[PDB]
Each structure stands twice: as structure tokens, then as C-alpha cells.
Amino acid sequence: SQWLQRTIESAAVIVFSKTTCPFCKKLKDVLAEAKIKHATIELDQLSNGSVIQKALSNFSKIETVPQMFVRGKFIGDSKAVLNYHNNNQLQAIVNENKYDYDLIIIGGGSGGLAAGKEAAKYGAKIAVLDYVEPTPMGTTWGLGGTCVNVGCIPKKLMHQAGLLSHSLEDAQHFGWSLDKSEISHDWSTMVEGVQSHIGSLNWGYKVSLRDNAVTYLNARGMLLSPHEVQITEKNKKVSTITGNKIILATGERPKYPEIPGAIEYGITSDDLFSLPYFPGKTLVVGASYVALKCAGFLASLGGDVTVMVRSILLRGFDQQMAEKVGDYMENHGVKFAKLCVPDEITQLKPVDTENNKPGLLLVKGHYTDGKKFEEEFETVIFAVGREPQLSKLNCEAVGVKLDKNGRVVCSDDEQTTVSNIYAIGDINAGKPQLTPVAIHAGRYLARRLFAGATELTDYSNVATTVFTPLEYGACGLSEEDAIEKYGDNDIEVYHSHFKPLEWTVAHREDNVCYMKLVCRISDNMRVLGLHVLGPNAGEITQGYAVAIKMGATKEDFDRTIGIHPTCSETFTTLHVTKRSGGSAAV
Amino acid sequence: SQWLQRTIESAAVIVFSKTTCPFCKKLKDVLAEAKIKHATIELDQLSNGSVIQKALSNFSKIETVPQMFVRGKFIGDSKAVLNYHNNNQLQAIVNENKYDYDLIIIGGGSGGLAAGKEAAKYGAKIAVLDYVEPTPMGTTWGLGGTCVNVGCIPKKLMHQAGLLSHSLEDAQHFGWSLDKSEISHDWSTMVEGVQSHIGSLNWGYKVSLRDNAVTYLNARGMLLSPHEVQITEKNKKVSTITGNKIILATGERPKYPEIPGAIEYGITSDDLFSLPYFPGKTLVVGASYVALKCAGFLASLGGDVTVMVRSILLRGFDQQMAEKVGDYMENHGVKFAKLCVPDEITQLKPVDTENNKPGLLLVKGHYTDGKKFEEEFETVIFAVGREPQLSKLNCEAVGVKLDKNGRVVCSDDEQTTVSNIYAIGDINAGKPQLTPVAIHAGRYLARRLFAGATELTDYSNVATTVFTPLEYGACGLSEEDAIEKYGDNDIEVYHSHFKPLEWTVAHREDNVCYMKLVCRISDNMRVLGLHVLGPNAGEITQGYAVAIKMGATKEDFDRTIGIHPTCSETFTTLHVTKRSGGSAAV
Ligand SMILES: Cc1cc2nc3c(=O)[nH]c(=O)nc-3n(CC(O)[C@H](O)[C@H](O)COP(=O)(O)OP(=O)(O)OC[C@H]3O[C@@H](n4cnc5c(N)ncnc54)[C@H](O)[C@@H]3O)c2cc1C
Ligand SMILES: Cc1cc2nc3c(=O)[nH]c(=O)nc-3n(CC(O)[C@H](O)[C@H](O)COP(=O)(O)OP(=O)(O)OC[C@H]3O[C@@H](n4cnc5c(N)ncnc54)[C@H](O)[C@@H]3O)c2cc1C
């Protein structure tokens, strides 16, 4: 409509087609033959194809299909394009570009490359810029950004190492003759295994870009203008490349509290996953999910672990669930300094760089009542949040609006305040900071830009899992958010404790695993929020995310039959409401 | 309509009410105080509530709420009931009953007690009869039927014991200093733990009934007439109880091949889960899920196991998945005798009871080409199916029709050929033979009988899981059933192999785990069947079964954001179709 204008202007190569057109087939065939990638709109498959079809004439003077366009320019019908092909002019035609690239992606984590690959599918010439600025202590890593190198992957693996600890304890109860008390964990062995897989993922990412004819540049990018990006390469060589669309996907880096010794002596999660030695007696500063995930596996690997909590656990998360996650960790080796903040870190012993041992630090802090905190630790980890650094990008002078937190202010289609610039992933203000969200948005946007797609990313009801020793899966609203949003008398919570069959013989807790469904009474008992604390919580939660996406109700869960025996089946037979005051025990 | 008539006719105690009527609140409160349980139809919550309220006068001669009925008789309004209460006549009135019981349930396994507990909710006086006839070697057990004693619970527990073997192997790779090769397993220790848990379940089942004021008699039941049941108690005392409604829920028992040596020398799953000694070198006859589940954990516990397969694995399941399941087992030590059946079993050595060891058995059989089979085993397990035993219930004389397999024939509301007699669980012909189905169907039936419910059980797309060493979860159609039902050109199959992140560091198989969605093109790529082979298949599959119940399409799956990192998230990004010929490999 006007959709057509935008579509024709921004597509690199696009064919307007109908599935019942043998000339369309022929055209598509020669493009496949010539190995030319392009978008394709099948007008017969759109409810308004006829309107679009007629409207094509304003760009090409014709109303028939197929019609092929390259960067806003009409190239021809079937016969016209076959001529170019037979005459060896087509490659030049499809490669004619006023910019160096159709698309320049700044940042090589989860979002950018997902967007790059997707865009390259439709013939967009694409560059991905990635540069990893080292941690204060000099830690650096390869392509794939946060998740691949210092996030989801190493976390989950170390988490599993942690879980295997519990299985070692449990095996005796299942008839296995194993004394856990003569078994030790070797941190180095674990770290090598982890770093091995990461390195494979680094290369995987490189190869993947290469396989999609996406250009990878290991360089720091900076915006000079809406279409000009300055790059600084390893050799300190500086140059300029131009692009039509620009995607900002630079992610964030961990914050350090502004206290003496923090930068010099502490580490963050950025360093943890490649640490040469077991952290030893550890203080984790922070109470986000990263803080607790790390505290948890370190404890499970037999570390002496303290978690310093400024206010509450898992801000943003259902607070009942947060408390249970915390209570589980406290009962399984993790100590909490509640309502406490650090004031300084001092060094008592340096790292033992020739025996592979940590040093020793003195941490001074205070509780909210003014009482002093003072304790020794071999390692201090800061998990007090993450921040973007788009200052170095020259965003604002190029006209990109940032919010008070330094994040990019975007419309619902990822568009910044500069029309050809977009942002995805962690730097996109207000969006859930998860990897599959970055990837999903990245792919959807690329389709809107280069294939004429109109589907927006839906950021609502994005399921999550916190991989604490007892995992916490969640999809949708927290109880207190649903009550805030809809009022108490419109909210029903169905809940139940449960005990995994596996825990029974292993003599583990009754009534620690717990799940609930928060529901809107007025909306046919609509499922607003799903929450489960238990093993494999992520595998449990995922399937339900689809049902919730589809607008699942309590009746939809009830009418579904359980798989037995599983933890998950408990969601299909919940009946005790909180309002009833009935016991949720097993 | 006539719904109102049926409801009043079969309800034990029922109150017609409105949420906004304080006299209704008042009445319900005195009933509660009196500990009188009843059904409640809140009329202002039924779209035809105004109709029903008028319709009630045909019974009570009044059109106001509350109205209370006992066993078909109008008892009074709020004032009349409170009058009986203050005259100390209320208990006597609600207990008046022409039969000993409102409901008699013959069989105390999965369905029976679920139905029993549910009916007691609404004031139905209920007996649950359970009796366990011992195996041929004299194995007996307590309450809770097959699942609790010789089914799902012991099976899964031992599966877990088996899985721990891989966990021990894996832990070495995650840094734990343990040599799996020097760790032994003790059958008895395991069996002690399992039986201890099974015992606490028997007890739980007994207490549960008691707490619900359901009478439990450990007796064998027999129909004498549509309302009379003969019970035979432990002391061989014989008597007759009467009931208004009867539910048959008597389950099935394992079958034996009609060959010499079978009964005398072999065992079945009824015996396995409490065997005094480890099976040893073992033949498993049969190829159903029970055969393979058992064979699998026996192998994982270091057993020498052979499975004898008459024709195929998992008849009734998707044969591609079946083959992958089998291949996995063969690769991890299960031997298969394919296209083979046994002809006789001979004893070579008797069971050694003073040493607590299995004996030795010669098995002779034959393959489909005639070639002979002759091998020695210490234990032969038959898993060749289950059969009902409704011979002893006297169905024929009373008029309850059975099919050719001796299972009860029932309409879609579980009713038998005798109007007041119903059948649930494994004996209900043509229903999914699974524990949660029995339970669900039981609970729904009790509501239709005693709480005026109208909801029938939907037996379609019931999800299952086979707890083989590598698990297989499924929901909906197999590919072959889908193709046969809809035509090849209307069926699209998306699939992908995957590697659990946990398997990376553990150095487990590339490209063995596998998932697929079987979809119908004509119907908006409707998901007809989901299949997944990998760890925790049951936890993964469960959530999707709600989405499938809701009519999920492929686009519903696609637009759901994955939880990362998990196995399940692979479902939200399937793109490779079988039709495309593209590789499903990671
Ligand atoms: C410890 C931890 C655990 C986590 N666990 C999970 C989890 O289990 N599940 C989950 O869904 N999410 C998890 N996350 C969140 C997560 O992984 C991020 O959401 C994801 O990495 C964001 O992807 P991104 O592409 O937006 O940014 P990033 O992955 O951070 O990548 C951006 C890249 O751009 C680079 N860059 C920055 N500036 C420039 C520049 N000027 N020029 C060129 N390149 C630049 C950066 O170095 C970086 O490599 C975790 C995060 C952390 C810190
Ligand atoms: C080895 C094995 C593993 C299994 N694993 C699973 C699984 O992982 N998941 C799953 O969903 N299903 C599983 N099943 C299926 C399963 O357990 C049954 O589907 C379930 O028990 C059916 O419930 P039921 O109440 O109909 O029958 P039952 O549980 O067998 O109960 C019937 C009870 O009534 C008793 N009875 C019989 N006659 C009389 C009489 N005249 N008087 C009084 N009492 C009587 C019986 O002794 C029995 O106790 C498994 C089955 C087996 C054999």
C-alpha cells in the first residue's frame, strides 16, 4: 500500500510472484541457477495481493507477474531477467549498490548474527562487526558474544557439573556403592572441557557467517552518520564503510560498584568461566539471577559461598518464588548477608600464579542498620547488573535517542529515532534480556527489512528459567504483578507442592518443589502466569509457553491428561486455590 | 432440561444456590459446620440458570434459592433445612439411603480411588473394594493397583537407578574424580529402597480414602445383580452390599505365552520389581514399552539382557521413533533376537534359595525363517501384554457386555450395557491404557454422577512417554497414521536432531536425540503429532500436550520464544522438512 513503497525501497533483491505462474517459476529457477538470493512475495497468498499487484505499476509501469526489483529499481519481468542472465549482465545488476552494504550489524553476540544470517537469505549484502573489549584483568574471548562465551552456555554447563554433584550423593540410595567422601572435583578439568566447547562455538559462529556470505569483521564499530560506520581493526587500522540499514546489537558488560578495590581485586561473570583456579571461599555481590546461578554451582562444587544481598532476591521476579529459591540455597550450603553492601576490597594475599591458587581479599561493608561487615574471601564476584556502553558508538550525535539508563529507545519494530537504524537484544530499552529474544527479534526484523514481512516481535509471555541449584521456570506474570494489574478479586492462584519420584528414594525434601498458576477469573480463568520450582524446570516450562501464547485457560490445563510419572503432570491437576486457604502440601 | 432431572435423580446431596445469596451462604455454612458434604450448582453462573431455577419448581414447588435435595428428594429451603438442623434431624436426613452405598467401586488401583475420592466430595457414600490375587510364584502387594506396586512407580524408580550409571560416567568429564569402572551396584539395596517407597504409597492410598470418608474393604468383589455385590474378605467371610452406582475398575494382569515352562519357570513385571535377587542373564520376551523399559534399566545396571521380538518394536507407536529407540538400546548393550518367538522353557538348575540366586533355564524357540533358537538364561521375563480378568466378576449373568478381548464395552460416558454400572481404566475397551487416563476419567465420571457435570472425557491426543534408556515422548499421531489418514501431499514433517548441552562435555553421541512435528498442510499446518527422543522426554512433551489439545499450528510453535539453553526450545525453531530432503543433523 505504502507498505509497498517501503518494501521496494529497502529490499536488496525481491521478486513479486504468484504460485500459479509458470513464468514466475522460470524466473525463480534462473535465479537459483545463478545462485542469486532474493525475497519473494507470492501475491496469490495475500488477501490483498490484487491491490498490491495493480499498485506495482507505479514502480514498473506494468501489472503482470513476475516483477523483479533490485534496491528500489525495477529490473524486469521473466523475459527481461532471462536476457540479463543469458547475457552475463545479471550478476552485475544484482550487485549494484550505492553503499558498501545493505546491512551493517554492529555486535556479534546472539542478536546481530541471527539478523545477519536471516537478512543474507534474501540477498542483502551484510557485514557483522564484533570486537570484545577485555575485562579489567585482561580476559577476552571469541565470536558469539555474551551467551556463547560468558553467559548461558558456560553457566548451564557449570550448573550441570553442580547437579552431577547431587547425583553422586543420590546414587548410593539407588544401590550404587559410591562413597562421595572420597571423590573430589577438579576445577581445571571442568574449565578445560567448558572452554573447549566454547572455542568450538566461536568457530561455529565464524563458519556460519561465512556459509551465509555474511562478511565478518573483527573490529570496533562507531557511527559517523546514519550510513557511515567507522571501523578500527586489530592492526589499529581505521577506515569507513557504508550501509543502508544499520542494526545496533552491542549488548552490555558487567558493572562494578564504585568502591576502592573492586576493579583491582574483584572479578565478574565475564572472568569466572575461564578462571584458572577454583575461586575457593567466595563472596558473590549481587542478587540477580546471575548472582544466584553462580553462587549455586560454586556451592555444589563444594565451595564456601556467601551472597551479599542489598535488598531482595531476583528483583523483577515473582517474590514468593524468589524466597523459595533463596530458602533452598540457604539450606544447601549458601550463606546470605542480607541488607548489606560492600564498601571496600583490600588484598591480603596475591593470586598464586605458579601453584594455580587464588589470593585472599578483605571485604569491608555495612548493613542497613549501620553494623559493620568484615570478612575474608579468596575470590569476590560482582553480579550487580550489566550496562550498555553506547557512548563509544556516537549514538546521540548521529541522532539515536538513548534513555536515562543509556539504552536505545525503540519503537515496537526495533526502529530507533534515526529511520534506517534499528536496535535489538539487551540494548533495546524495556525488552526482556534473553538470548532467544535477541535471535527471534533479529530474524523477524530482517524479514521486515528485506522480505517485506510485517510481523512484529511479541515480547509478552516470554518464558524464562533461572538455573539455581533448584531451578525456577516462569512464563507470564508474577502473582503480585497480576494482582496489581487486575485486582485481588479477579485473581485466582492454583498451587501445589510436589515431590519428584527421584527424590523419594534419595530421601530429599517433601514440600520444597512448588508450582502455581496465576489466573484471571473474569477472563474465563485465563492463565496469566506459570511458575515452577523443581528439577528440569526449563524443560517443563517450555511446552506451556506455547499454550499460554495461544491464550490458555485453567480449563485447557484441566482437560489435558498428564504423563505419568513426571513433575510436569502436576500442572494438569491443580485444584487448591490460595483463596481457599487449603493446604498445598503433598 | 432433563439434565436437571438426571442430576437430582443421581445426586446424593445437592444444593442449588447463587454466589450473591446470603441465605445460600448461610445454608452452605451450616452444612459445612455439620460436616455434610454436597454438590453445589450456583445458578447465577450458568447461562441457562434462569431456566433451571424455574424448572426446579417441578420438584420443590418453589423457584427461590437455596434448594436442597437428598437422593432425589427435595429437603427444603434455607428455613426448612435449618429447622431440621435445629431439630437434630439433619444428619439422619442426609444419610437416608435405600442402598448401603451411593457408589461401589470394584478395584483399588488408579481409577477406582480417584473416582471414589471425587464422589465423596459431593456426599456420595462410597465403598472401594481392592484385592490382589498373587502371581504364580505368590507375589502379592498392597493398595494402589498396578502403577503403585508393579507398574509406573517401581519402573521409573529403577529407570532412574539405570540413568545414574550415565550420570556417574558423565561426572568424570565434568571434573569429578571418580572411576565409574570400579563402582558396583547392589540390586537388593535398590529393591529395599523402592519397596519402602511403594509401601508408603499403599499407606498413603489407604489414608487418603479414609480421610475422604470413603470405605475401603480389602476384599474380592463379584456382581450378583445390578445393585448387589458379593464381597469375600480375607477370612473367607462372604457377604452382600448394595449400591446405587457401581464402577468396575479392576485393571489387568500380565499374560503368559501358552508354552511349556512359562508359568513354572518364567516371571513377569508383576514379579520383577520385588525379586529377592538380581535377574542375571535375562531374556525379555516381548517388544512393547514394558519389555523395553525393563530390558533397558537391567542393561544399565550391568545386566546381560536379550529382548525377543516377534515382529516389531512398539507396535502402535511411530515406527521411525521405535527404530531409533531400539538402535539406542542395541548400541548401549541390549541384544535383540528379531523375528523370534519362544517354543518352550526348561529348567536346568532350580532357583538357589539358600544362596538367594536365580536358577538356570534353557529357552528353545524359532525364527520366522525356521532357523532354531536355543540359549541359556537365569531369568526369563514375559512382557507379552496384559489382559482383563472379568471372569470372576460374574458380568455375563448380570448383563455387562464384554468384547472379544474380554474388556467391558462402554459408551462415551463410561456406561456399560447395565444402566447403573460404569467401567473405567484398563478394562474400558479401546481406551488409552494409562494411569492418568484412568484417574481423569474416574474423576470426570464421579462429577457427572454426583455433581451434575456434563463434561465427557476426551481420549484423543493423550501424551505418553516410554522410559527407555533414551526416553521417547509422544502426543498425537504417528507420521504413518497421519500420512495414511490424510494423504502424503497433505502431510508436512518438520524435524531436527539435537545434542543436549550436557552431552557436549560428557562426549555423548552427536545426532542421536531427535524430534519432529507431524503437520497437516490443508489445516494451517496443524500439528497432528509431536515426537521427541532425548533426556527427560516426558517433562518436555507434557507442556506441548496442552497446546495440542488447543489446536496448535506450526506457526504457534514458531512464534513462541525458546527457553535457552534447553532441549525443548528446539521445538520452537523447527524449519527443516523431510520433504525438502535436507539434513536433520545438528
Ligand atoms: C552470566 C549470564 C548468564 C546468562 N544466562 C542466560 C540464559 O540461561 N538464557 C538466556 O536466554 N539468556 C541468558 N543471559 C543473557 C544473554 O546471554 C544476553 O541476553 C545475550 O547475550 C544478548 O545478546 P546480544 O546479541 O544482544 O548482546 P551480546 O551477546 O552481549 O553481544 C554483543 C556483542 O557486541 C560486541 N560489541 C560491543 N560494542 C561493540 C562495538 N562498538 N563494535 C563492535 N562490537 C561491539 C560485544 O563485545 C559483544 O560481543 C545470560 C547473561 C549473563 C551475563
Ligand atoms: C510394568 C508397567 C509399567 C507401567 N508404566 C506406566 C507409566 O510409566 N505411565 C502410565 O500412564 N501407565 C503405566 N502403566 C500402565 C498402568 O499402570 C495402568 O494403566 C494403571 O494401573 C491402570 O489403572 P487401573 O485402575 O485401571 O488398573 P489397576 O491399577 O491394575 O487396578 C486394578 C485393581 O483392582 C484389583 N481387583 C481386580 N479384581 C478385583 C475384584 N474382583 N475385587 C476387588 N479388587 C479387584 C486389582 O488387583 C487391582 O489392584 C504401566 C503398567 C505396567 C504393567
PDB file of N, CA, C and O in Angstrom, chain A residues 15-41:
ATOM      1  N   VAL A  15      11.390 -10.533  -5.699  1.00  0.00           N
ATOM      2  CA  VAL A  15      10.521 -10.946  -6.777  1.00  0.00           C
ATOM      3  C   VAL A  15       9.061 -10.969  -6.316  1.00  0.00           C
ATOM      4  O   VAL A  15       8.730 -11.616  -5.321  1.00  0.00           O
ATOM      5  N   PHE A  16       8.202 -10.244  -7.032  1.00  0.00           N
ATOM      6  CA  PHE A  16       6.752 -10.349  -6.858  1.00  0.00           C
ATOM      7  C   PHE A  16       6.218 -11.423  -7.790  1.00  0.00           C
ATOM      8  O   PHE A  16       6.505 -11.422  -8.989  1.00  0.00           O
ATOM      9  N   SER A  17       5.433 -12.335  -7.230  1.00  0.00           N
ATOM     10  CA  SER A  17       5.158 -13.603  -7.883  1.00  0.00           C
ATOM     11  C   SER A  17       3.740 -14.107  -7.579  1.00  0.00           C
ATOM     12  O   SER A  17       3.027 -13.526  -6.760  1.00  0.00           O
ATOM     13  N   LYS A  18       3.337 -15.169  -8.268  1.00  0.00           N
ATOM     14  CA  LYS A  18       2.159 -15.951  -7.906  1.00  0.00           C
ATOM     15  C   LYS A  18       2.568 -17.394  -8.069  1.00  0.00           C
ATOM     16  O   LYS A  18       3.389 -17.706  -8.939  1.00  0.00           O
ATOM     17  N   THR A  19       2.005 -18.276  -7.245  1.00  0.00           N
ATOM     18  CA  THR A  19       2.438 -19.672  -7.228  1.00  0.00           C
ATOM     19  C   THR A  19       1.926 -20.415  -8.456  1.00  0.00           C
ATOM     20  O   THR A  19       2.449 -21.465  -8.824  1.00  0.00           O
ATOM     21  N   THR A  20       0.916 -19.852  -9.101  1.00  0.00           N
ATOM     22  CA  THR A  20       0.365 -20.458 -10.296  1.00  0.00           C
ATOM     23  C   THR A  20       0.821 -19.723 -11.555  1.00  0.00           C
ATOM     24  O   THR A  20       0.045 -19.517 -12.492  1.00  0.00           O
ATOM     25  N   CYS A  21       2.087 -19.326 -11.578  1.00  0.00           N
ATOM     26  CA  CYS A  21       2.632 -18.641 -12.742  1.00  0.00           C
ATOM     27  C   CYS A  21       3.903 -19.336 -13.208  1.00  0.00           C
ATOM     28  O   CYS A  21       4.927 -19.307 -12.528  1.00  0.00           O
ATOM     29  N   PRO A  22       3.838 -19.988 -14.374  1.00  0.00           N
ATOM     30  CA  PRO A  22       4.982 -20.763 -14.873  1.00  0.00           C
ATOM     31  C   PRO A  22       6.168 -19.868 -15.261  1.00  0.00           C
ATOM     32  O   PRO A  22       7.310 -20.321 -15.223  1.00  0.00           O
ATOM     33  N   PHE A  23       5.896 -18.618 -15.621  1.00  0.00           N
ATOM     34  CA  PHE A  23       6.949 -17.636 -15.852  1.00  0.00           C
ATOM     35  C   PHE A  23       7.647 -17.247 -14.537  1.00  0.00           C
ATOM     36  O   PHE A  23       8.863 -17.002 -14.509  1.00  0.00           O
ATOM     37  N   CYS A  24       6.867 -17.187 -13.458  1.00  0.00           N
ATOM     38  CA  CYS A  24       7.404 -16.918 -12.132  1.00  0.00           C
ATOM     39  C   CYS A  24       8.344 -18.031 -11.737  1.00  0.00           C
ATOM     40  O   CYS A  24       9.432 -17.772 -11.227  1.00  0.00           O
ATOM     41  N   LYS A  25       7.918 -19.269 -11.976  1.00  0.00           N
ATOM     42  CA  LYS A  25       8.759 -20.424 -11.696  1.00  0.00           C
ATOM     43  C   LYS A  25      10.085 -20.310 -12.449  1.00  0.00           C
ATOM     44  O   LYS A  25      11.159 -20.409 -11.846  1.00  0.00           O
ATOM     45  N   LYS A  26       9.994 -20.070 -13.756  1.00  0.00           N
ATOM     46  CA  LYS A  26      11.168 -19.914 -14.620  1.00  0.00           C
ATOM     47  C   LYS A  26      12.135 -18.870 -14.080  1.00  0.00           C
ATOM     48  O   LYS A  26      13.327 -19.124 -13.962  1.00  0.00           O
ATOM     49  N   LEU A  27      11.605 -17.701 -13.745  1.00  0.00           N
ATOM     50  CA  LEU A  27      12.420 -16.652 -13.161  1.00  0.00           C
ATOM     51  C   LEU A  27      13.117 -17.125 -11.894  1.00  0.00           C
ATOM     52  O   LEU A  27      14.333 -16.954 -11.742  1.00  0.00           O
ATOM     53  N   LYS A  28      12.349 -17.716 -10.988  1.00  0.00           N
ATOM     54  CA  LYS A  28      12.909 -18.183  -9.727  1.00  0.00           C
ATOM     55  C   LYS A  28      13.998 -19.209 -10.007  1.00  0.00           C
ATOM     56  O   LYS A  28      15.056 -19.211  -9.366  1.00  0.00           O
ATOM     57  N   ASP A  29      13.752 -20.032 -11.020  1.00  0.00           N
ATOM     58  CA  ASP A  29      14.692 -21.069 -11.416  1.00  0.00           C
ATOM     59  C   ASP A  29      16.036 -20.540 -11.899  1.00  0.00           C
ATOM     60  O   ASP A  29      17.077 -21.040 -11.476  1.00  0.00           O
ATOM     61  N   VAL A  30      16.024 -19.550 -12.789  1.00  0.00           N
ATOM     62  CA  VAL A  30      17.285 -18.978 -13.258  1.00  0.00           C
ATOM     63  C   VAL A  30      18.031 -18.252 -12.135  1.00  0.00           C
ATOM     64  O   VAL A  30      19.267 -18.236 -12.118  1.00  0.00           O
ATOM     65  N   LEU A  31      17.294 -17.674 -11.189  1.00  0.00           N
ATOM     66  CA  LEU A  31      17.948 -17.025 -10.053  1.00  0.00           C
ATOM     67  C   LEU A  31      18.589 -18.071  -9.144  1.00  0.00           C
ATOM     68  O   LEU A  31      19.673 -17.849  -8.605  1.00  0.00           O
ATOM     69  N   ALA A  32      17.930 -19.215  -8.986  1.00  0.00           N
ATOM     70  CA  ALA A  32      18.511 -20.298  -8.198  1.00  0.00           C
ATOM     71  C   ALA A  32      19.753 -20.812  -8.915  1.00  0.00           C
ATOM     72  O   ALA A  32      20.820 -20.952  -8.312  1.00  0.00           O
ATOM     73  N   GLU A  33      19.603 -21.051 -10.215  1.00  0.00           N
ATOM     74  CA  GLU A  33      20.707 -21.438 -11.092  1.00  0.00           C
ATOM     75  C   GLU A  33      21.895 -20.489 -10.980  1.00  0.00           C
ATOM     76  O   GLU A  33      23.043 -20.912 -10.895  1.00  0.00           O
ATOM     77  N   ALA A  34      21.621 -19.194 -10.974  1.00  0.00           N
ATOM     78  CA  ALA A  34      22.690 -18.210 -10.899  1.00  0.00           C
ATOM     79  C   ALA A  34      23.149 -18.009  -9.461  1.00  0.00           C
ATOM     80  O   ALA A  34      24.011 -17.171  -9.191  1.00  0.00           O
ATOM     81  N   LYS A  35      22.562 -18.780  -8.549  1.00  0.00           N
ATOM     82  CA  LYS A  35      22.839 -18.668  -7.118  1.00  0.00           C
ATOM     83  C   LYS A  35      22.621 -17.247  -6.571  1.00  0.00           C
ATOM     84  O   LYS A  35      23.446 -16.716  -5.817  1.00  0.00           O
ATOM     85  N   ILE A  36      21.503 -16.641  -6.967  1.00  0.00           N
ATOM     86  CA  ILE A  36      21.145 -15.314  -6.506  1.00  0.00           C
ATOM     87  C   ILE A  36      20.036 -15.421  -5.462  1.00  0.00           C
ATOM     88  O   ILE A  36      18.982 -16.009  -5.709  1.00  0.00           O
ATOM     89  N   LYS A  37      20.286 -14.854  -4.290  1.00  0.00           N
ATOM     90  CA  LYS A  37      19.323 -14.913  -3.205  1.00  0.00           C
ATOM     91  C   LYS A  37      18.439 -13.676  -3.261  1.00  0.00           C
ATOM     92  O   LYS A  37      18.893 -12.590  -3.611  1.00  0.00           O
ATOM     93  N   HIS A  38      17.172 -13.841  -2.921  1.00  0.00           N
ATOM     94  CA  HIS A  38      16.225 -12.762  -3.069  1.00  0.00           C
ATOM     95  C   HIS A  38      15.020 -13.068  -2.233  1.00  0.00           C
ATOM     96  O   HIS A  38      14.779 -14.217  -1.899  1.00  0.00           O
ATOM     97  N   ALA A  39      14.256 -12.033  -1.911  1.00  0.00           N
ATOM     98  CA  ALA A  39      12.964 -12.231  -1.282  1.00  0.00           C
ATOM     99  C   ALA A  39      11.963 -12.572  -2.367  1.00  0.00           C
ATOM    100  O   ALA A  39      12.208 -12.321  -3.551  1.00  0.00           O
ATOM    101  N   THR A  40      10.850 -13.167  -1.957  1.00  0.00           N
ATOM    102  CA  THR A  40       9.769 -13.481  -2.860  1.00  0.00           C
ATOM    103  C   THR A  40       8.442 -13.223  -2.154  1.00  0.00           C
ATOM    104  O   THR A  40       8.217 -13.719  -1.060  1.00  0.00           O
ATOM    105  N   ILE A  41       7.578 -12.435  -2.776  1.00  0.00           N
ATOM    106  CA  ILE A  41       6.218 -12.263  -2.294  1.00  0.00           C
ATOM    107  C   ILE A  41       5.272 -13.006  -3.235  1.00  0.00           C
ATOM    108  O   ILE A  41       5.246 -12.723  -4.432  1.00  0.00           O
TER     109      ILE A  41
END
